[PDB]
Amino acid sequence: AMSKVLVLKSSILATSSQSNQLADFFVEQWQAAHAGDQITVRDLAAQPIPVLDGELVGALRPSALTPRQQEALALSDELIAELQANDVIVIAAPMYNFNIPTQLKNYFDMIARAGVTFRYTEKGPEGLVTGKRAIILTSRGTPTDLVVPYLRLFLGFIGITDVEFVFAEADAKTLLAQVVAA
């Protein structure tokens, strides 16, 4: 009866990032609290995700595929399988020029595929990544905090409805301890 937690780091400042510091503290805290849980950490900056281009869009089509497109498609299936395998989804999404980091944006463009991560129904589109609890490490800032509706909308589209946002500005680590203890 273990839980699998996926942690997604996207900051480009590496160990210098406050978001990555809070993500690592989150890993240590969850490992201490639930010694049996299995934690997977993917760094989207250290190992980047390719940019969504026309050839990538061709590779991710529901329907001939070049070697490049086969590699890209294989990577997309890897990310989707890893995402569906984990019960808790921790996403570190700091704000770069009023948007999420490009790395995480590539991740999103590679995990959003019709018929795999969502489907069309007579009642409308519905997501297929079900039963996930998502926690978002983000910053807090005519509002400029448009990242929250974007992440809630995107994640909800692929079926991740249960999304909690924790904002960072000591106090943030007490909040993350409350999240891990919940």
- Closest CB to a copy of itself among 136 and 179? 136
- Closest CB to a copy of itself among 52 and 75? 52
Distance CA(19)–CA(9), nearest Å, equals 8
DSSP structure string for 55-94: HHHHHT------HHHHHHHHHHHHHHHHHHH-SEEEEE--
Q: How far is the CB of 154 from a copy of itself (least distance, A)?
A: 5
Place of tokens 């509706």: 149
Q: How far is the CB of 55 from a copy of itself (least distance, A)?
A: 9
Torsions phi, psi for 163 (to 5 deg) = -125, 120
Q: How far is the CB of 7 from a copy of itself (least distance, A)?
A: 19
**Roughly how many angstroms between the first and final C-alpha of the chain, as a whole number?**
17
- Closest CB to a copy of itself among 63 and 97? 97
Q: Which chain residues interact with a copy of itself by CB under 8 A?
A: 12-14, 45, 48, 51-54, 57, 96-103, 105-106, 108-109, 112, 142-144, 146, 149-150, 152-154, 156-157
For helices 67-85 and 102-111, angle between their N-to-C axes, nearest 10 degrees: 90
2 carries a ligand binding annotation: no
- Closest CB to a copy of itself among 36 and 54? 54
10 carries a ligand binding annotation: no
97 carries a ligand binding annotation: yes
**CA distances (Å), 55 to each of 52, 69, 77, 174, in order?**
8, 7, 16, 45
Q: How far is the CB of 121 from a copy of itself (least distance, A)?
A: 17
156 carries a ligand binding annotation: no
Q: How far is the CB of 107 from a copy of itself (least distance, A)?
A: 11
3 carries a ligand binding annotation: no
Helical segments of the chain, H only: 18-33, 54-59, 67-85, 102-111, 147-157, 171-181
Contact 144, 175 (CB under 8 A): no
118 carries a ligand binding annotation: no
- Closest CB to a copy of itself among 2 and 51? 51
**Residues flagged as binding site:** 11, 17-19, 95-98, 139-141
